[PDB]
Design a binder for these strands. Sequence first.
DNA 1: ACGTTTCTAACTATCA
DNA 2: GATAGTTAGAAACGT
Lengths: 571, 153, 274, 168
Amino acid sequence: MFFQIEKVVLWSKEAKHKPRVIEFALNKVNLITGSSKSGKSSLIPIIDYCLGSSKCSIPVNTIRDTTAWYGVQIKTKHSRLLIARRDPSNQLSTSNAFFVEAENIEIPQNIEKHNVNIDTVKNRLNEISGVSNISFDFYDTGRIDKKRTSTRDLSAFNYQPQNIIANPNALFYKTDSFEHKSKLVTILPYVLGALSNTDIENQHRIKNLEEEYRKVERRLLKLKRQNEDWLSSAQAYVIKAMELGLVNSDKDIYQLKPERLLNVLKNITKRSRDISNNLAKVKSRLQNINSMNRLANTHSDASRLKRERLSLSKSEPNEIRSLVLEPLARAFSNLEAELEVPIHVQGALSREKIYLEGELTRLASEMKDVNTYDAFSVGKFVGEVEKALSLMGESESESELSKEYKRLKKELSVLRLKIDPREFERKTKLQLAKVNKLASDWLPHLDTENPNAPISLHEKELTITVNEIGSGANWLSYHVAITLALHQHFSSLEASPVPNYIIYDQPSQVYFDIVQVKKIFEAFNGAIEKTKDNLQIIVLDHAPSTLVKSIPKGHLVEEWRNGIKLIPLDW
Amino acid sequence: QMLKPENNLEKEAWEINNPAMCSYMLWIATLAYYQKQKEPIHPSRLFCLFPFILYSDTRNVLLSSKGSLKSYLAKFSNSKAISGDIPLSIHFRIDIQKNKTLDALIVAFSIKPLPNSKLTDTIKELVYCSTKIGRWLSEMTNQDLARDLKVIF
Amino acid sequence: IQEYRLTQRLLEANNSSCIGFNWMDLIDSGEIDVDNTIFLLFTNKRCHSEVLQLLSTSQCRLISKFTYIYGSGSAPHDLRESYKLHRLGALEEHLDEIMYEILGWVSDVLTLAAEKRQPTIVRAKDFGARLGEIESKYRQKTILNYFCNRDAPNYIKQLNLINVDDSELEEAAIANLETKDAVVEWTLNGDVQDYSYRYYQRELRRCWGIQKQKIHLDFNGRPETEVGQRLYIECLNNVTRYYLENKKVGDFFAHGTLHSMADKLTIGWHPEFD
Amino acid sequence: DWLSSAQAYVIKAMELGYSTSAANIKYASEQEAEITKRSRDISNNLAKVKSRLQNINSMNRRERLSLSKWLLTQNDINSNEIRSLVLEPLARAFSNLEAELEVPIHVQGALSREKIYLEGELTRLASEMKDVNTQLKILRGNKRKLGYDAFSVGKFVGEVEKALSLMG
DNA sequence: ACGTTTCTAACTATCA
DNA sequence: GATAGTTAGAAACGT
């Protein structure tokens, strides 16, 4: 997004004055001229520690001895923000933040304790940045390589300290061995423009639809594709209905349609019946008697808790009290009748049933004794016909089941085919080719062994892959070319989550030859106006202040804001 | 104008009480507002912000409170809860006001708050939650109110 | 006379066959007897020309189970005191009714034994079964007016107009309060909007109003109240599919909502004026 | 799930029988009550999850809330003093938040983890709803299936063989 | 790159 | 205004 540093604060331990502001001009190339050991190279860990760093790389015995609060101010696309952070001191690196936000930012004095945690600052930066909240884990392994991407994770390609500018091994900020290389190979297609917030939700929505597919296709459509043997026996077991014949059975199998045959299929010993009247419409309503006692016992226990959970009933209108307050005040006085349960409920649950177990199971044993077509034949046939008809398309193209297969399961292939991994690879290769063809424009603006060889990168390692031999300060030229290429690509994009500032720290650390750094500042001059003034460059060097005066995009803040050192000795 | 349609009630669905639960969101979202940082917001300004004292998934993460509203909304948006969309329901839960905000404020229009000893396990919890809410809105501006609550009023 | 006190000896029994019962006492084991077999419980006067004090309750055959009431004190207050004491509980002020339908049982068996001159063997097990059925009925109706009254509600009085069963009155009383509890619990969490109930129960005229007129034009041989019989059983099957409460709700809902209409003035399952 | 869809006949078989038992009827009523309370819990959670999905995902196609000029929209939802003394200052103070700044706030703050978790919750709660609805349908019958005689036990074992001979 | 286990610190209720 | 007390904050392992 638009996210540019305006000014950097360094609060003292409340001696007299001087919160030590280090300002930066917006959308320019910012330079301060340095002495030998003024300590200006440690401003990058100060700003990174203010941004939400877990550790603190602010150096010991020079800066941390006389500083209480560290703050930076970064202007957003809308309004600004100031992120302060106190000194870690004894508790390793675990201070918390002071995070104010307004349209304009004013620096107060020391603000004693903190008010906002550092994960709060990280979450606010993420919701400003527009990064996806997804965990990036398309197999859901709980990985840190595939995790939620933060603006703290986007602090790479934003700071170029002393140790990595003249180093081809480490390309960006704090990604030397494995601290951010995994969470940059995870997020490079997302920041190059291949993916978006709506695009990143597809790779787990398709897994949810795959789970729904495995739910529906586990049966493999028993009602549709695995019922041919039932239709083979649909015209075969009707000869058993002739044997157990009460209704008019089938006249002839090979005389009717199968639909007509299914429509046909739709349709001393009396002591068992003379016992069975107390088990059909007496024991069934006795199970319902158990539903009077036990269900209402647990309901009166539950509505006791529901009324206990209603422990909360306790302009000049005229009906706002008698009909709106007074029913609630009345219902507060009616809660006391709900904690009481009558003793007859559990009495009928336990004791009345224990007197009745011999009153109902005795006739059940009598029915068993006198139970030694058939009695269960019309039970086993009528009712199984109903279950067979309710198993074959009672709701298949009408309400649910196979109706959703023509709707939901025709969207799984739609979601799989509208954005495949082939489209992701093609878009990330197009964006990588765009950032490579945009990269070589500063090769005439800079100087290398070859100012026309097309430089390139790859996602899988994030290193310098030009087409080495005769290297040195050429690593700095490749570094500024690749950083300006990536930041110009992010500025030319829409909804890019990356802050558009690059901080450079000692380009002339290999040299100390002013023509090379002059052409470096010429490239920095050019790169601001390619996207029509959406980029910031901060340079920290001992180069003289005259290298920006003949440059339209170049700014000095009069050394260390008219100072001699970063830390003033007059604190 | 009265707030219940007389005897033509669908059911007694007002477990959230319009004149008994909340007045200015239990009336102590303006007493804590006066307590922390004195800004009036009484004659015309808007209390129709945070009826998450009236939601039993957000009132629970408001008992465990930090000391800033942004920290609470950040505690909404980590992997402990797998959430973050429900902060954006400040935008959504004031259109029709299913939480009955702007209806449960007519009854409101400085005596002491009722002490925490008379607990009742829900009323004092909501009182603590709404005092946290009321003291948390006094540290923000209107642009901050549209910013971190994610609303366009 | 005897009916007001015959149940008293039956309460102190355990399938003991308390017999209720000159012109008698020649029956030497006419029917099948039991070990206790409380015999000869029939006196109504003092001594006369026939000496009834020949054994004077010494306690036909060798060992006598003769026991008679002295003084002919029919219908006493200690008949009621034998129920509060001895066995069983109950005592929820509907005990005069339990007595009134337990003197009817011994009155009915004494009327059955008035004609058909065989002995008057009274089962104590059947007395216990009848007393248990009466106790179950009165415990069931004292379960009611607690889960219904917050006398009788306005959705149960109209459900007794068609009066399908008592289990439907149970399901109405369970479902109305369970629906109220779920609405209270939803309002506790803010899950369901307050205006969603007007979008769910005022649109049940797609059942009460188009199926109130469906079977009335289909069935015309139903004189007074059977035309509202199957309307209830069709509403109870055609309302558990409605997706107007945002997401579809459980089967316990829209049954107690139909019962929640009839607590106030509404149209309902009754085909009459109320 | 086939195990949750066939939780009945592991309770209803000894509810029916063969010989009945009042303790078995009590146990089957207890298990049916547990299944119904699980159905209520799944109903509540599914309704909440789908309500949040239908609420939050409306901005995929944010929006201006437009609580200004709501003396004509929210004036008649209540059953004049609400308007003229409370909402009339609020009519002139609801537009003092959107129109006070020139540029409205665009789409900021992703919902991707929330959308994915809510859709997975929708799938799981719909599956559990289908399982417990089949459980209640088998345990409760259509309208008249409760019977321990020679007819309804045969109907239940016919339904058991029809729902077990194919669905494994 | 922060969540996920244990630990201490602190300020603020809850009673001084 | 004091003992608890709950929640906020600290350090290493995950990968």
